[PDB]
Amino acid sequence: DYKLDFRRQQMQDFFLAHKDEEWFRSKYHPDEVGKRRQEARGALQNRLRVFLSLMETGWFDNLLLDIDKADAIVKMLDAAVIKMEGGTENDLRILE
Amino acid sequence: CKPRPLHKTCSLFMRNIAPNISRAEIISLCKRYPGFMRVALSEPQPERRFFRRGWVTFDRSVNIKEICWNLQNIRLRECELSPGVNRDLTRRVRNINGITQHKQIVRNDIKLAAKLIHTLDDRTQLWQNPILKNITDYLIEEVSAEEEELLGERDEKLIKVLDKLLLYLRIVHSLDYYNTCEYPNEDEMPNRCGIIHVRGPMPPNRISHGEVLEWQKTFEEKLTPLLSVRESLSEEEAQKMGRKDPEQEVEKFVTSNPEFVRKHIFNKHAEKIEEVKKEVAFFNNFLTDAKRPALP
């Protein structure tokens, strides 16, 4: 059996060759995987807050995903990013 | 107080960045220019020996052309960055086929969107979701069959439901529905909410009988990759490749490093025994995964 032994070499060569690199550590290393998901869920919860903020404020109250309201969507998407960065209702005024 | 242009962000772009280079040194390189915000790296690609595409984002009140020139002939760990000024997105709101604003196909998309949100809320572990309350009411047909039996196109009520689901998918989970793709790193990259996809104007000819069903088969086929669980080898296949046992290789570390020597390592040096177990799991997670990074 060669193919079995061949895939062992390639795998183990790659684990050696990319052991200490950031991207590889982040995918598989227990410490870095855990600290990645905390950042992810922390940043995702920030995006959830923004969606719930845009709901009650009514930024997509009369807004359908259609090219007739293409300019209205862009105006909303800007307001989404402003709230992600953390701007108040004052900071949104430049869109008006 | 003056209002800020927080939606606008000018940024740099780097074509080839090495895999051994982390965010740390790229951030601290670009940190000392005022108005710096965040660095974003792409997923490395095996075709270029796992090289990453970078994106250094700056504030709008900054001259990016000077800062791009400043770092133009500057290397970092035997790798020339050579940035270029990443221009803004021109065409954001893009079209798709006009068939997707139909009664039956919107109902189909509400079912699939509801399925995606259930899955993504479990996967990410947020929260229950208020936009998924009484969605089952909108999935069922409601018709006057008896009044036809005895005697004998747009539906905005369904579309307004769909939009709240599709906007949630896009804004929260970075999932553009109609294009059928994720934008996973968006929250670090310069434009946080870039390209959204939108329904077409309208079909010129009649809406065909079987063509509506053929779209639903094709559209659901593209969405199924987005809810893909990460692969794993079988118990025998993983063991034959060489799954290292944690407690066994801890014993190999102790014997290499008689009875008084073993009681010293476990009790005093408690940090090392877990560090070996972590690097075993580091290797086993890479082994178990049946979709590894490797040279093509």
Numbering used by the authors:
A (entry chain A): 174 to 269
B (entry chain C): 411 to 537, 553 to 577, 599 to 703, 724 to 762
Question: Can you provide the manuscript's text about this entry?
Answer:
ARS2 is a direct interaction partner of CBC and together they form a platform for the assembly of co-transcriptional complexes that determine the fate of diverse RNA Pol II transcripts. Our structural analysis shows that ARS2 is made up of two regions, residues 147–270 and 408–763 that co-fold into a structured core with an intervening glutamate-rich region of unknown function that is likely unstructured. The human ARS2 core has an unusual structure comprising a largely helical ‘body’ from which project N- and C-terminal ‘legs’. We find that the RRM domain is required to bind RNA, whereas a basic patch in the C-terminal leg of ARS2 mediates the interaction with FLASH.
Based on the incomplete model, the N-terminal helix was truncated at position 171 with the aim of producing better crystals. ARS2171–270+408–763 crystallised in hexagonal space groups P6522 or P65, diffracting to 3.2 and 3.5 Å resolution, respectively. In mammals, loop A (538-ASEPGT543PPLPTSLPS-552) is highly conserved and proline-rich. In most crystal forms, the loop is disordered presumably due to flexibility. In all crystal structures of hARS2 (except that with loop B deleted), only the first part of the loop is observed with 570-AEEEELL forming helix α10 (‘EEEE helix’). Remarkably, all crystal forms containing loop B, irrespective of space-group, exhibit the same intermolecular crystal contact, in which the acidic ‘EEEE helix’ and the preceding short β-strand pack into the positively charged cradle formed by the RRM β-sheet and the C-terminal extension of the RRM. To accommodate the same intermolecular contact in different crystal-packing environments, some angular flexibility of the loop B structure is required. Concerning loop B, in most ARS2 crystal forms the negatively charged ‘EEEE’ helix binds onto the positively charged RRM β-sheet surface of a neighbouring molecule. Repetition of this inter-molecular contact generates a three-dimensional network.
